[PDB]
């Protein structure tokens, strides 16, 4: 194994890439994009002071990635801490549960495209896919899923504005802005139908399904 100085150096260096792991290998990305799109939808571009949305997304990601973290700890961190598995093998052992989560959610078309772009040989099963193919395929699938969720989210908040504008126009009040009238009604809707519990549960199911 590596010398203790080398192990400490590698550990300290790997501690740097935590935001990269959170953004490109974790549920955080499609746990945010949805929040940004929803904030764009309600007409309040500030409302939940960002930091609030970031904290909620962090807690949601922690609750969602719990089984993956548990599997990594039981399979990789526990043997490594007990001097049973070397430092250069704990990483390889722990990268597998994260890779499997990254697959359970990564679409195919993306996998085929990034298998073609690397000029790699045929991949008869999912067990032959390396991380260099799964990483951007997972990223693209997460982006597409987040945008789909946000774009079906956007529809009712535009429907309300449409009906508000039509009703205002029936009576000839053509110089009344419709957005100012629609914003309180959009807030009322998002209050009534458990705006956040339904969205939270839908996102969590969207991961576990």
């Amino acid at each position: 194994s590596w010398s203790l100085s080398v192990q400490t150096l590698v550990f300290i260096t790997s501690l740097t890439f935590l935001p990269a792991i959170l953004l490109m290998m974790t549920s955080f990305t499609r746990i945010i994009i949805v929040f940004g799109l929803l904030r764009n939808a309600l007409g309040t571009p500030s409302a939940p002071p960002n930091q609030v949305l970031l904290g909620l997304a962090l807690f949601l990601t922690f609750f969602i990635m719990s089984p993956v973290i548990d599997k990594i700890y039981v399979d990789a961190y526990q043997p490594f801490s007990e001097q049973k598995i070397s430092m250069q093998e704990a990483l390889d052992k722990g990268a597998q549960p994260l890779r499997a989560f990254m697959l359970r959610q990564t679409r195919e078309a993306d996998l085929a495209l990034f298998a073609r772009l690397a000029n790699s040989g045929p991949l008869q099963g999912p067990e032959a896919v390396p991380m260099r193919i799964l990483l951007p395929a997972y990223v693209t699938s997460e982006l597409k899923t987040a945008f789909q969720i946000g774009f079906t989210i956007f529809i009712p908040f535009l429907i309300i504005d449409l009906v508000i504008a039509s009703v205002l126009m029936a009576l000839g009040m053509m110089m009344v802005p419709p957005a100012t009238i629609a914003l309180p009604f959009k807030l009322m809707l998002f209050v009534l139908v458990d705006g956040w519990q339904l969205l939270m549960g839908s996102l969590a199911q969207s991961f576990y399904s």
Partner: protein, 112 residues
């Protein structure tokens, strides 16, 4: 009625209404074919399409109950029971045969 009920040209209140209509039509056609068979005078098929959980990746599967009325003394063959099972199971996406119950006009379970 089956597909005829769908062909009544009636407004589908909602997707849910459409789904109910589809379930009914399938039930009707299945009962129809079951009656067509020699020993069967009339058939009644009930389908239960299942529903998903909330955060549970654990899944289940649909179920069917088939009641047959036989012609005076026309007992169904073991092979017959088997063919009814196959038809009903195939007609329902992901219907595990073992979830098809076949019963006669006297309340005897013809399946397991």
């Amino acid at each position: 009625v089956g597909f005829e009920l769908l062909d009544q040209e009636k407004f589908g209140i909602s997707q849910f209404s459409e789904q109910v209509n589809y379930q009914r039509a399938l039930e009707g056609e299945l009962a129809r074919t079951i009656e067509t068979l020699g020993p069967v005078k009339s058939a009644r098929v009930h389908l239960a399409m299942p529903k998903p959980s909330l955060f549970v990746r654990e899944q289940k599967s649909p179920s069917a109950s088939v009641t047959v009325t036989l012609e005076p003394g026309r007992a169904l063959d073991e092979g017959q029971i088997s063919a009814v099972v196959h038809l009903v199971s195939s007609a329902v996406a992901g219907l595990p045969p073992g979830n098809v119950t076949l019963v006669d006009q006297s309340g005897h379970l013809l399946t397991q």
